[PDB]
Amino acid sequence: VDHYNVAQDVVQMLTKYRELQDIIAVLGIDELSEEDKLIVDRARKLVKFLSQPFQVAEVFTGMTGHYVQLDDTIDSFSGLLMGTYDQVPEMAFYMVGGINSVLEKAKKMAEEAAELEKMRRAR
């Protein structure tokens, strides 16, 4: 039942995202209400989060692949829908596998940007 509910919610959010993409194409992004903005952000994360690195492409693309277990998939998408991961950057979901990958890539992004600040602050 949880799997079915999560799948339907994702489909509903994606459909709403397409509708919101049409309004911003006319009214503008600033015209969306507070709820619509949150829906857009969550949907964009979902779209970025649906991409996976295949182990078969390790040689060509270099990046190590991921095999996401079903239990992880339901929990990872369920948490995103509720809004638990509303503070993670959008790009942390692009071509990553599982929720844990989203977090480690956030560490590597937060720590990476930390050096950039000490550089840009200095110099």
Partner: peptide
């Protein structure tokens, strides 16, 4: 008022999520 009177895998994700966001606040500070 009476209510006030009376009073592991998921932990790793909460730990990482908290710690992940910890550096995100620190970078903003300095």
């Amino acid at each position: 008022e009476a209510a006030e009177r009376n009073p592991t895998g998921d932990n790793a994700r909460d730990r990482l999520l908290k710690e992940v966001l910890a550096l995100q606040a620190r970078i903003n500070q300095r």
